[PDB]
Amino acid sequence: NVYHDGACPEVKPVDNFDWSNYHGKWWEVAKYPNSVEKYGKCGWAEYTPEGKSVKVSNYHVIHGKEYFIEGTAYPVGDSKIGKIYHKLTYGGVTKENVFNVLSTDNKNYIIGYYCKYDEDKKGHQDFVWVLSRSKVLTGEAKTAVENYLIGSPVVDSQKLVYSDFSEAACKVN
Amino acid sequence: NVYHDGACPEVKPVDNFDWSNYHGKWWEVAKYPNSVEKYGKCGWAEYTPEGKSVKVSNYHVIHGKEYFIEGTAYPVGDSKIGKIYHKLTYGGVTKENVFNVLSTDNKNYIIGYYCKYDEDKKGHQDFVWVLSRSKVLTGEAKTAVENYLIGSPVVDSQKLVYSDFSEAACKVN
Amino acid sequence: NVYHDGACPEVKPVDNFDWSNYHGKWWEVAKYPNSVEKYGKCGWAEYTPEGKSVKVSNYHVIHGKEYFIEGTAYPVGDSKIGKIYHKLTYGGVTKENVFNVLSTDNKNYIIGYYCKYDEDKKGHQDFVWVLSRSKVLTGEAKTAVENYLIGSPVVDSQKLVYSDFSEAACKVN
Amino acid sequence: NVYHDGACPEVKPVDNFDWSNYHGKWWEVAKYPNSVEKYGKCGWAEYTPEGKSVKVSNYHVIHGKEYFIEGTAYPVGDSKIGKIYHKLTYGGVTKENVFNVLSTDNKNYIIGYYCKYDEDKKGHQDFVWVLSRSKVLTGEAKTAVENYLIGSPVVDSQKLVYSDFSEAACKVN
Ligand SMILES: C=Cc1c(/C=c2\[nH]/c(=C\C3=NC(=O)C(CCC(=O)O)=C3C)c(C=C)c2C)[nH]c(/C=C2\NC(=O)C(CCC(=O)O)=C2C)c1C
Ligand SMILES: C=Cc1c(/C=c2\[nH]/c(=C\C3=NC(=O)C(CCC(=O)O)=C3C)c(C=C)c2C)[nH]c(/C=C2\NC(=O)C(CCC(=O)O)=C2C)c1C
Ligand SMILES: C=Cc1c(/C=c2\[nH]/c(=C\C3=NC(=O)C(CCC(=O)O)=C3C)c(C=C)c2C)[nH]c(/C=C2\NC(=O)C(CCC(=O)O)=C2C)c1C
Ligand SMILES: C=Cc1c(/C=c2\[nH]/c(=C\C3=NC(=O)C(CCC(=O)O)=C3C)c(C=C)c2C)[nH]c(/C=C2\NC(=O)C(CCC(=O)O)=C2C)c1C
């Protein structure tokens, strides 16, 4: 889990988000570690569209067993601004969590960020995911991701943990 | 927070621990991040000997405000072996958590490990602290710590975060 | 610069090195600092295969000006064994310096070590490079470089300095 | 060796320097590594007044053998201001090098800094020494050293290397 002092940074999302492409199975190729996804392997997100909204379900495997959450996702304002609410319930509190699409090709990959702010302690936790339609980044998508990561003012490439997509890791029994 | 798969690893504690030095104020010079201490600055532990035991108090400061837990510590067996129970209560459950002393000069520094196992997920969380009687490592202590870190089978120094002992950080109001 | 007392340590190279992949452009993702590359950013190596040998060109960029050296590398013995001579001239003097490939995937990354021994002062300087066909370590190659760095007796990951591959740093006129 | 891009930092020397006390024998308790002092142990300096100047002799010991340089030191202006010229020869070139006294008690210790700028590369090398009358810092002096290092804009405590004052380190054959 990646903590910092202070408020959530001012982040600039993509201005050209293609809401059409937001569907299907996205593999979580990397992330910053977090407590909810603790121990999880072979992670993915599954987006099923309903207009300018999507039904969300996020899965991962731990030792042969599948775990998931369901929720819904829709743009905060204009579909083209890469800022999307993901409405999930944690701890019996349901909140609209702003996912920011920092980088995308509207085809193969998403690099997105969520910041959880603590008012009482005046700090925040950073959550980052690299979601891809492929278990492995190749070619242009991989090239795009690298160049983003090298300039990124928000994402620390070192802190990224890359998911295991072994058949062993991915097995549900 | 540092997560790995599998049960808690077997570690070798120091076999020459001087329990009589185990008192006084020990600054948290560095640690693996964990959720209980998120956003805290200027941490320290204070061990107040009570013959057999020591009373434990662990502090930090967040934005002029002090937070703490109190507990009790005692050797798991032979006092010269670097296995010390720390009896703390979290979430209404009281546990005798084993703290392994991985390296120490028996005067200025102590490098310690606690492993938290998840029986359901067949994985564990690693907790590491570098404790020092001075806010900054100097002389032989600094060298000893450096060298241990570099050889350690358990501690990945690259996951250490060193504390903020600024005047401002430490200011309590 | 990383100095240690005593002779060069006995390192264990890879015994499955694939000479046939020793070509192309290998970004200097990290190194131990040394005097010759001081100030240089965006560094790379270029290995031009000439069959038995390779032509070596090592570059970096300092303030829009590009600096480099050229040499020749060829295996110290058996191709499969991860010891390569790098024949370079410094101080009007051509040596055949042994580069030890400590870890590799024979595809994306290479972790290498050269040790410069001072006979008169019975000390040595350590040279470590982390080389990759991409400017940012991603996926399995990232995991593999980390997990090596953690277990390595030779390399202290805390003495690594990661290169800057920003557009600005890589800008040459 | 500690290298940075850019011009030398603006540094604030002590304005209460006691030139009278800048005499006699000072151990080098710590430094930033540098190439001149490569492999050296048990190092010390000796200042021998000659009027408004002091004659300088800097020593260390490498495997029973003694190595040294001589030169002269005198103030840049007013002796109350801790910037001192240290006139030494290296590479057949004799230069006046500014040594800035960042912190001192004028009794036990001195923390000093020299910055070596590369005009060609537009970068600089940092040189930091922690001098003391005593081979081990203790008491108020230690505390003074610790405190300075907590807030120091220039000196990184982690980059200090602490000299070896073992009799074996100090033994001259
Ligand atoms: C494919 C990416 C992805 C993902 C992403 C994700 N989560 C989000 C939201 C959050 N994730 C989090 O972990 C928290 C909780 C923060 C907190 O309150 O602790 C939030 C809000 C957002 C955008 C806001 C996104 C894109 N989340 C998961 C995984 C999961 N998230 C879960 O809640 C579970 C079930 C855990 C269990 O019941 O044991 C899984 C597997 C995956 C695999
Ligand atoms: C000086 C070192 C040190 C430390 C040490 C410490 N904690 C220990 C134990 C634990 N810490 C933890 O965070 C958990 C896991 C609790 C859980 O189950 O989530 C355990 C068992 C152990 C013994 C192994 C040790 C040495 N612990 C702290 C700090 C703290 N630990 C605390 O519980 C709090 C209270 C936070 C609050 O009330 O909001 C502080 C400040 C410091 C500053
Ligand atoms: C991508 C990795 C890499 C590299 C690698 C490298 N160098 C090596 C060799 C050495 N480097 C050194 O610095 C010395 C010691 C020279 C000495 O001081 O005697 C040697 C032998 C070896 C072989 C083990 C390897 C793999 N070397 C460089 C960079 C350079 N090496 C150079 O000599 C120069 C030109 C400096 C100038 O003209 O001002 C550059 C840019 C890069 C960027
Ligand atoms: C007690 C502290 C101290 C010290 C200090 C020192 N050096 C200074 C100067 C420099 N040191 C350096 O290494 C260089 C050389 C920069 C260059 O390489 O051009 C400079 C100018 C300055 C003031 C700026 C100070 C206070 N310098 C030494 C040690 C030495 N300095 C030496 O030149 C040698 C002889 C090396 C040999 O003959 O092989 C020793 C032992 C000690 C032990």
Swiss-Prot record, chains A, B, C, D:
Belongs to the calycin superfamily. Lipocalin family. GO terms for biological process: lipid metabolic process; response to reactive oxygen species. This is Bilin-binding protein. InterPro entries: Calycin, Invtbrt_color, Lipocalin_ApoD, Lipocalin_CS, Lipocln_cytosolic_FA-bd_dom. PROSITE patterns: LIPOCALIN. One of its GO terms (cellular component) is extracellular region. Hemolymph. This protein binds the blue pigments bilins. The keyword Disulfide bond applies. The keyword Disulfide bond applies. PANTHER family: APOLIPOPROTEIN D. Its main location: secreted. Keywords: Bile pigment, Chromophore, Disulfide bond, Pigment, Secreted, Signal. Homotetramer. The lineage of its organism: Eukaryota, Metazoa, Ecdysozoa, Arthropoda, Hexapoda.
